[PDB]
Design a protein around this nucleic acid. Structure first.
Ligand SMILES: Nc1ccc(CNc2ncnc3c2ncn3[C@@H]2O[C@H](CO)[C@@H](O)[C@H]2O)cc1
Ligand SMILES: [K+]
Ligand SMILES: [K+]
Length: 545
DNA sequence: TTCAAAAAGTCCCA
DNA sequence: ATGGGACTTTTTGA
C-alpha cells in the first residue's frame, strides 16, 4: 500500500514549491504532505528548509528575536512550525517520526505528524506549500462503503467512475493558503478522461496552474502499470494565466539520464509549449501551435461527427468469459445447437479495414429457455463455473439466471454490417465486419444511421478513419493509457468529426481496392501501402493541411 | 431495465 | 531476477 516516488522527481517537486521562498519575509512556512508515507517528500523538505534557515541565520537573528534564531535552534523550529504530514498507515508515520528525530532528551520536540484519513480530518488551518504523491484507487478497488462517503462529501469532483486521487486534488486545493503553491505527481488520465471533467473544472476555476509535466506512457514507477504527470499550481493573484507544458517526446527514456529532472525537461527528450488557462474548455487540449492549427482546421472543415451519423454500442459482457467462450474446435460445441452459437473475436483480431477470421464461439445462453430442455449444455459447459456465475451482481439480485450472460445486449445490433475497432490500440484500426462477429467490451462497434447511408458508406468511413491524418487527429485529444496504447472508447471516438467533398468517390474507391487486396488469399500487402499513401494525400488535400 | 467507463493494468519471457 | 512487450475482464455507477 506504500509506493516509492523516484528521488529525481521528489527533488523536483520540493524545489518547485520552495526554490523562491523568501525565508526572511516568512520564516514560518507550513509545508504539508497528506499522504506522506515514510517521508520521501518530507525528509527532503527538511534538508531544503535547513539550508534555507542556515544560509540566512544572521539576517533572521538581526530582524527578529536574536536569541531564538540560532543555528542550534533550526532543527527544533522546523519540526515545531514548518513540517506537517498525514498518512493512514501507522507504521509509516512511526518510521517517519524517527527519521525526523534522527536529523539532529532535551525538551521532547513535538512533530506535526497525524495518523488519520486526510479526506476526513478537520484541518485547523491552511498551508503555504503542499507536495506529495496521493493514493490512486479506481472504482473497482475502492470499498463501496467508502465510495458513499466520497459521493456525498466530494461530489464536486467525485462521481461515477472517478478515482480517489481526484478527492486529494480537491482537499489539497481547499487547504492551500492564498498565495500558496502545490505540486503533486498523480496519474495523467484525468487530463483527458471523461471522469475527470469535474476535477478539471475545479482545478481551472480555483487555482492557477503553473506547470504540467506529462510523461505520457513512460514508466516512472518501476513495476507499476500507471502513467504519470506532475502538476504545479498556486493561489497567487496573477493577471497572467499561462501554463508551462512539458510533454515527453520519447517514452523509452530512463528517468535517471541526468542528475536533475529539469535537465531532462530542457533537453531534446521533452517539448515545451504554453497554454492559456482562460482558453481551456471542459476539455484541456494541451498541444503545440502546429497541432492546434492542425486540429482546428479539421474541426472547422468537418460538418458531421460520427455521433451524428452512427449508432455506437459496447460489446457483450458475459461476466464470466470462461463459462461461455469456447474454441471453435472444442468438442463440447457438439453439445450446443448452432442457433445458440455466435462468432467471437478479440481486439487483436481487428486490423485496419477487415477482421481476422474468428477462432472462438460464444454460447448466447440467453436463448436457452429453461434448465430442463438443454441440461447437457448447462451441466457440462456453463455449470463448471456456476459458483463464479452466481456471484455476479445481477444473479445475486435475481435479475439474471445463473447461466445467462450478464449484459447480452441486443443480438440484432451485432448481426449486421458494421464497423468495429479495438478499445485499446497504438493506432487507428477501424474494420468493416462482414461476418456478424460478436465480441466482448475490448471491441466497440457502430453502424451508420439509415438517414445517412446516402451520404456516407462504410467503405468511405474506414478509408478516412484509418488514414494517417485521422490517426494524428484522434490522438491529439485521445486518452493516453500506457506506452503505445490509447483508449479507443465511444466517449471520444464518437466525437471524431468527418467531412464529405469532391474527393469522396476516389477515397471510397481507394478504400475498396485496399479491402479487395486485403481479403485476397495471395494478399499483396505492398500495394496496400501505396494506395494508403495516395488516400492520405487526398485527405490532406481535402482538409487543406 | 440496461447502458458504457475504468489501467498504482495483468501476464509472460528473456 | 527485472524490464519490456503483447494483449486485454467484469465490476460498477448511473
Ligand atoms: N479505508 C480507507 C482509508 C483512507 C482512505 C483515503 N485516505 C487516506 N488518507 C491518508 N493517507 C492515505 C489515505 N489513503 C491512502 N493513504 C496513503 O497514501 C500513500 C500513497 O500510497 C500511502 O502511504 C497510503 O498509506 C481510503 C480508504
Ligand atoms: K534582533
Ligand atoms: K506507464
Amino acid at each position: 500500500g506504500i509506493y516509492y516516488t523516484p528521488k529525481i522527481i521528489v527533488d523536483y517537486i520540493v524545489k518547485k514549491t520552495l526554490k523562491n521562498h523568501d525565508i526572511i519575509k516568512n520564516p514560518y512556512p507550513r509545508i504539508l504532505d497528506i499522504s506522506c508515507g515514510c517521508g520521501n517528500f518530507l525528509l527532503e523538505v527538511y534538508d531544503i528548509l535547513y539550508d534555507l534557515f542556515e544560509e540566512n541565520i544572521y539576517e533572521l537573528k538581526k530582524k527578529y528575536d536574536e536569541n531564538y534564531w540560532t543555528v542550534d535552534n533550526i532543527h527544533r523550529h522546523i519540526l515545531n512550525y514548518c513540517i506537517y504530514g498525514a498518512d493512514i498507515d501507522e507504521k509509516a508515520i512511526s518510521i517517519l517520526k524517527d527519521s525526523l528525530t534522527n536529523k539532529k532528551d532535551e525538551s521532547d520536540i513535538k512533530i506535526n505528524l497525524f495518523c488519520c484519513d486526510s479526506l476526513k480530518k478537520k484541518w485547523r488551518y491552511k498551508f503555504d506549500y503542499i507536495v506529495g504523491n496521493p493514493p490512486y484507487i479506481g472504482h473497482k478497488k475502492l470499498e463501496k462503503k467508502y465510495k458513499k462517503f466520497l459521493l456525498e462529501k466530494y461530489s464536486e469532483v467525485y462521481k461515477d467512475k472517478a478515482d480517489l486521487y481526484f478527492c486529494f486534488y480537491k482537499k489539497i486545493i481547499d487547504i492551500l493558503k492564498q498565495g500558496g503553491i502545490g505540486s503533486v505527481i498523480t496519474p495523467r488520465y484525468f487530463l483527458e478522461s471523461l471522469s475527470g471533467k469535474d476535477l478539471r473544472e475545479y482545478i481551472k476555476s480555483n487555482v492557477n496552474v503553473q506547470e504540467i509535466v506529462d510523461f505520457l506512457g513512460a514508466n516512472i514507477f518501476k513495476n507499476i502499470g500507471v502513467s504519470s504527470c506532475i502538476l504545479t499550481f498556486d493561489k497567487k493573484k496573477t493577471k497572467e494565466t499561462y501554463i508551462d507544458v512539458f510533454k515527453i517526446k520519447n517514452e523509452d527514456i530512463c528517468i535517471n539520464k541526468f542528475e536533475t529532472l529539469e535537465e531532462l525537461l530542457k533537453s531534446s527528450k521533452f517539448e515545451h509549449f504554453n497554454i492559456n488557462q482562460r482558453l481551456l474548455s471542459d476539455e484541456w487540449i494541451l498541444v503545440n501551435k502546429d497541432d492546434e492549427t492542425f486540429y482546428n482546421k479539421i474541426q472547422e472543415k468537418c460538418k458531421y461527427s460520427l455521433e451524428d451519423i452512427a449508432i455506437s454500442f459496447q460489446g457483450i459482457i458475459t461476466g464470466c468469459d470462461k463459462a461461455f467462450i469456447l474454441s471453435k474446435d472444442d468438442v463440447k460445441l457438439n453439445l450446443v445447437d448452432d442457433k445458440f452459437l455466435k462468432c467471437w473475436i478479440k481486439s487483436k483480431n481487428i486490423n485496419k479495414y477487415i477482421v481476422d477470421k474468428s477462432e472462438y464461439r460464444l454460447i448466447y445462453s440467453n436463448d436457452i429457455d429453461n434448465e430442463n430442455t438443454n441440461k447437457r449444455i448447462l451441466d457440462e459447459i456453463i455449470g463448471l463455473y456456476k459458483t463464479k456465475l452466481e456471484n455476479r451482481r445481477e444473479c445475486k439480485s435475481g435479475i439474471r439466471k445463473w447461466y445467462e450472460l450478464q449484459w447480452g445486449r441486443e443480438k440484432l445490433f451485432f448481426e449486421r454490417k458494421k464497423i468495429m475497432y479495438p478499445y485499446k490500440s497504438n493506432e487507428n484500426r477501424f474494420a468493416i465486419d462482414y461476418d456478424n462477429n460478436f465480441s466482448s467490451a475490448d471491441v466497440y462497434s457502430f453502424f451508420i444511421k439509415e438517414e445517412y447511408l446516402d451520404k456516407f458508406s462504410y467503405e468511405y468511413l474506414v478509408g478516412i478513419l484509418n488514414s494517417s491524418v485521422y490517426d494524428k487527429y484522434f490522438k491529439i485529444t485521445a486518452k493516453k493509457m500506457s506506452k503505445n496504447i490509447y483508449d479507443y472508447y465511444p466517449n471520444k471516438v464518437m466525437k471524431i468529426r468527418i467531412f464529405r467533398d469532391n474527393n469522396y468517390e476516389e477515397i471510397e474507391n481507394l478504400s475498396k481496392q485496399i479491402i479487395s487486396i486485403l481479403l485476397n488469399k495471395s494478399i499483396d500487402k505492398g500495394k496496400v501501402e501505396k494506395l494508403q499513401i495516395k488516400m492520405d494525400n487526398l485527405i490532406m488535400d481535402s482538409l487543406g493541411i
